[PDB]
Amino acid sequence: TGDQRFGDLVFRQLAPNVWQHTSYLAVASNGLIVRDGGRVLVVDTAWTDDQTAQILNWIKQEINLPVALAVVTHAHQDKMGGMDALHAAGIATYANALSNQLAPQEGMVAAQHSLTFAANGWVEPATAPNFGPLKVFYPGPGHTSDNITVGIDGTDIAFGGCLIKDSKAKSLGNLGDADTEHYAASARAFGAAFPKASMIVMSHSAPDSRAAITHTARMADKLR
Ligand SMILES: [Ca+2]
Ligand SMILES: [Ca+2]
Ligand SMILES: [Cl-]
Ligand SMILES: [Cl-]
Ligand SMILES: [Zn+2]
Ligand SMILES: [Zn+2]
Numbered sequence: 001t002g003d004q005r006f007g008d009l010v011f012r013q014l015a016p017n018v019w020q021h022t023s024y025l026a027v028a029s030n031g032l033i034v035r036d037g038g039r040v041l042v043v044d045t046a047w048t049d050d051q052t053a054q055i056l057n058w059i060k061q062e063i064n065l066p067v068a069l070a071v072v073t074h075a076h077q078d079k080m081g082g083m084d085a086l087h088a089a090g091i092a093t094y095a096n097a098l099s100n101q102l103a104p105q106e107g108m109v110a111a112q113h114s115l116t117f118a119a120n121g122w123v124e125p126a127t128a129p130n131f132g133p134l135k136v137f138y139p140g141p142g143h144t145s146d147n148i149t150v151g152i153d154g155t156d157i158a159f160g161g162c163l164i165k166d167s168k169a170k171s172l173g174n175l176g177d178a179d180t181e182h183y184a185a186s187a188r189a190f191g192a193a194f195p196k197a198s199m200i201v202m203s204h205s206a207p208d209s210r211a212a213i214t215h216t217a218r219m220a221d222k223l224r
Helices: 049-062 083-088 097-106 183-193 211-221
Strands: 004-006 009-015 018-024 028-036 039-043 067-072 092-096 113-115 134-137 149-152 157-159 199-201
Touching: 004 049, 009 049, 018 049, 028 049, 028 149, 028 157, 039 049, 049 083, 083 092, 092 097, 097 113, 134 183, 149 183, 183 211
Parallel strands: 039 067, 067 092, 092 113, 157 199
Antiparallel strands: 004 009, 009 018, 018 028, 028 039, 134 149, 149 157
């Protein structure tokens, strides 16, 4: 495959400057690593602090550039379970304000900084300083009320996190915290935000085409 293992973590290169990190609780969860010139940016923690430290040490070994910041895509264990490891390593952390507000209730450690969003879903840019190619979009409530998404400018890649399921999926997975009414529109809004992205990365399946977006929305239509 060309995948690399480091400890409990698996890494897959998606583009010259983009890798997928995969950690396991065994249920896989995926996030991203982005090389932006002389620094690295992370999207999502692993499930645990130990696994998240393994991400950081793989970065040091294989890329050897400082990790400037991390953005985490909602307040659940697969995305924010490793916040203490990021803070211990001195990595500035960012999440939706609503994720930070929900974090204690969800058993997560809040990020240091809060992202806020316009009515059209786009991040208010002063809340996302020096984000380089990361384009942060809040598509509306779906998998959770706080779920956010990230496009990588200059690439074909957009990250749907746990909102988006793969195009062969039989269900929308864990709907315990979901907004079943608004989910379909939120999935479609993600697609519209990143209209040229052709590789859709998501939390619990391998990267897919845009078919994942329209399939997710079709399944979500049946919840309303
Ligand atoms: Ca912890
Ligand atoms: Ca919950
Ligand atoms: Cl790239
Ligand atoms: Cl796009
Ligand atoms: Zn979740
Ligand atoms: Zn998830």
